[PDB]
Amino acid sequence: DDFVAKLQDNQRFRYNEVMQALNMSAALTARKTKEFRSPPQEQINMLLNFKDDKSECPCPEEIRDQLLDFHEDLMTHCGIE
Amino acid sequence: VVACFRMAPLYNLPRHRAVNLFLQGYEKSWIETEEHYFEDKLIEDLAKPGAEPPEEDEGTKRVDPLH
């Protein structure tokens, strides 16, 4: 609940400032808005793809660390450390 | 591309739909990919006979759990 709430808010914020920046950059904004053009399942896939260190996701650092900590807690609960 | 822009991003969708999408995506990206090695330990533990002399069978050793 809370994680996707903050994720949606930050997607709103990124969408807004990319919408501002399309005026300065027209070629780049298409590649940037491919994210918003893609279907919601694909969007949530790449938003959650911050696992490992490929670092191609647009997810921010604190949001990434929150899910990392929760995943560590879930693994500890499952008994696999 | 206009129709793609008009199609709602995750922030427009209601919270429950986004929660379900996050559940499926988290499953695929994290839970399935999470891999650990336990097979050798489990097989050795099953193969080890458990207190065969202490057990009062007075015969051939009982078949190990793996057997």
DSSP H helices in chain A: 2-21, 27-37, 40-48, 61-78
SS3 state of residue B55: coil
DSSP conformation letters of B36-50: ---HHHHHHHHHS--
**Residue A42: closest CA among chain B residues belongs to which residue?**
B25
**Residue B16: closest CA among chain A residues belongs to which residue?**
A1
The technique is cryo-EM
Half-sphere exposure in the Cβ direction for A4 (13 Å, CA): 23
**Residue A31: closest CA among chain B residues belongs to which residue?**
B1
Angle, helices A40-48 vs A27-37, to 10°: value is 100
Encode burial over B37-61: b for 16+ CB neighbours within 10 A, e otherwise: eeeeeeeeeeeeeeeeeeeeeeeee
Q: Are B10 and A11 in contact (CB under 8 A)?
A: yes
Among B1, B25, B34, select the one facing A37 at the smallest CB separation. B1
Q: Are A11 and B9 in contact (CB under 8 A)?
A: yes
Q: Are A49 and A57 in contact (CB under 8 A)?
A: yes
3-state helix, strand, coil in chain B (%, to 5): 45, 0, 55
What are the two backbone dihedrals, phi and then psi, of residue A60, each rounded to the nearest 5 degrees? -80, 170
A–B CB contacts, 8 A cutoff, strictly below: 69
Q: Are B64 and B46 in contact (CB under 8 A)?
A: yes
Q: Are B66 and B46 in contact (CB under 8 A)?
A: yes
Q: Cβ separation of B25 and A5 shorter than 8 Å?
A: no
Q: Which one of A2, A3, A4, A70 would you mutate to disrupt binding with B, by most B Cβ within 10 Å of its Cβ?
A: A4
Residue type, A22: L
Q: Cβ separation of A15 and B5 shorter than 8 Å?
A: no
Report d(CA A29, CA A48) in Å as an integer: 22
What are the two backbone dihedrals, phi and then psi, of residue A71, each rounded to the nearest 5 degrees? -65, -40
**Resolution to 1 decimal place, in Å:** 3.7
Report d(CA A14, CA A29) in Å as an integer: 12
Q: Cβ separation of B11 and A12 shorter than 8 Å?
A: yes
